[PDB]
Ligand binder design. Structure first.
Ligand SMILES: *[C@@H](O)[C@H](C[C@@H]1CCNC1=O)NC(=O)[C@H](CC(C)C)NC(=O)OC[C@@H]1CCC(=O)N1CCC1CCCCC1
Ligand SMILES: *[C@@H](O)[C@H](C[C@@H]1CCNC1=O)NC(=O)[C@H](CC(C)C)NC(=O)OC[C@@H]1CCC(=O)N1CCC1CCCCC1
Ligand SMILES: [Ca+2]
Lengths: 298, 301
């Protein structure tokens, strides 16, 4: 049982290169508009306390070089929505998929299409951490790479990449340009809030381990939801809600293991550890598979 | 650790996926130029499957017996042949989305992206490592056969795997795009055991190089080893012996860190013989073996 990303082709067809001065990053080209991080308009000096409204009014359309492959797209208009720049271009992208912009909740997962110079380079699954960071793989030039889910033929864009933190984790916005978390697009070392573990996802992954034939961690003990949550909070796990328990119904039915029985197994793991044993190859409790993620793979 | 399995973007492969049906049996095919490639067991019924005579089954087939579809759109078959365990269906339309491509046969330890597909429609993409026993640990369900594995270098797609079967232990086996199985396996509905698997030594060494690159280098020592001496110890710990090709593909990381391959092998030999003694490498007490030297450079640089 492994992380599976959505097929990325519908997003690849939207990626372009956006350049301003000596800064180059990626843009997302949908219909006749290119979306990208606004910090592309900052110089080395600006980046420490950039007054974006002032920096933007001093820009003209021809300051923005947009390239789709070896084709320049002429910028005929520009505006800013929160931390994203929207460049109107003279050419519509015929590869534009059916799409929407969604703001994801902490604990939800999405696929990242990492891009450099407008060229897609890798795809992988991420979760929105409870502290609103993501543990991405992003290098210099990755900004403007997007995260997404696919439902039927519709692409739900939920993330655009802006920055790395001192700890090596990453932060960004939705496609309306609002950051996830308390972060700011200035060139400063920024710490996140204390992260917690996504409990409903650990439970989904334990169920996956069961479906795969792994059951050493199960027990006959039981727990109430409240008592489980007391232990969870003690170990910096997120609360489990009744909606989470409901969400885990299908996996419970399939394995014949009551949700609260799986909670008791997890409680024992938190308290006793894994004793060197492993679950699905991991020495650690994995929390970036959602219940939906497990089902889609069974 | 800072590392994760990263697949290649799948779009160039998505544009090549079709479905191939014989009767009520549908699996996936790969449409490149005017040829569709798919597992030959599409032509087997559930009565042929225990031991098909593929040569005889194919004689009874005609072009008009194959239903090839891109989505709901039928692609007319104008020729058919068999190459080892793959069927090649010549069609009357060259795929306009054909990328630059080659067919490569990979070695154990090498990683590749799989585009898992059902009824010609992609479901997901993930990275797999070819184990030393010539199996992969995929997520492959009924209908997944004909899904392919690939790597992408500079817009060229190197196709290396086409899916055919699941073994009793839940792991997966298949062919290259010339239809030759990886490993001793055969496309029959029989129980086939893989060899006992071993740890991918070359990828563990890549992992140790990655740790060094990131400043985590407590395990480095002042000694070296010969390749033979290392391989003899490695086999005692169920590690794969190193080949010359393995030494060669560690070259870039050895140059980047200035640590000779054989010196890193001596460090690994000490870890094997003495264990970790309660220490971690890149955050883990476990040595990772599914990142290749190329994967490391791709995620570090
Ligand atoms: C895309 O433009 C770029 C993506 C980054 C680069 C490295 N990995 C990524 O994900 N993002 C940026 O360049 C950011 C631009 C800001 C928001 C104006 N900055 C950024 O990501 O900075 C990361 C660095 C490295 C770790 C760190 O703390 N930090 C913040 C700035 C740093 C603080 C210490 C003094 C020098 C500047
Ligand atoms: C694609 O057509 C299909 C992919 C399979 C389905 C389930 N997961 C997969 O990866 N492949 C097949 O159906 C194979 C067709 C043969 C090669 C003609 N067969 C196959 O994968 O068989 C799987 C079964 C289940 C476990 C097992 O060992 N095995 C082998 C066959 C047989 C089953 C009955 C018990 C003895 C072994
Ligand atoms: Ca042959």
């Amino acid at each position: 049982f492994r992380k599976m990303a959505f097929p990325s082709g519908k997003v690849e067809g939207c990626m372009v290169q956006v350049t301003c001065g000596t800064t180059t990053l990626n843009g997302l080209w949908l219909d006749d508009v290119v979306y990208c991080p606004r910090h592309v308009i900052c110089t080395s000096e600006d980046m420490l306390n950039p007054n974006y409204e002032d920096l933007l009014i001093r820009k003209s359309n021809h300051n923005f070089l947009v390239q789709a492959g070896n084709v320049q797209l002429r910028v005929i208009g520009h505006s800013m929505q929160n931390c994203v720049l929207k460049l109107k271009v003279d050419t519509a992208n015929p590869k534009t998929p059916k799409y929407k912009f969604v703001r994801i909740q902490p604990g939800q997962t999405f696929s990242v299409l990492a891009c450099y110079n407008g060229s897609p380079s890798g795809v992988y699954q991420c979760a929105m951490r409870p502290n609103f960071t993501i543990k991405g793989s992003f290098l210099n030039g990755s900004c403007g790479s997007v995260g997404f889910n696919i439902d039927y033929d519709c692409v739900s864009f939920c993330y655009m990449h802006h920055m790395e933190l001192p700890t090596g984790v990453h932060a960004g916005t939705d496609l309306e340009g609002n950051f996830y978390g308390p972060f700011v697009d200035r060139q400063t070392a920024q710490a996140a809030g204390t992260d917690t573990t996504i409990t409903v996802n650990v439970l989904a992954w334990l169920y996956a381990a069961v479906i795969n034939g792994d059951r050493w961690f199960l027990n006959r003990f039981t727990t109430t939801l409240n008592d489980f949550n007391l232990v969870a909070m003690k170990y910096n796990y997120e609360p489990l809600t009744q909606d989470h328990v409901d969400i885990l119904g299908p996996l419970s039915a399939q394995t014949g293991i009551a949700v609260l029985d799986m909670c008791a197994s997890l409680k024992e793991l938190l308290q006793n550890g894994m004793n060197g044993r492993t679950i699905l190859g991991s020495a650690l409790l994995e929390d970036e598979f959602t219940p939906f993620d497990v089902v889609r793979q069974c």
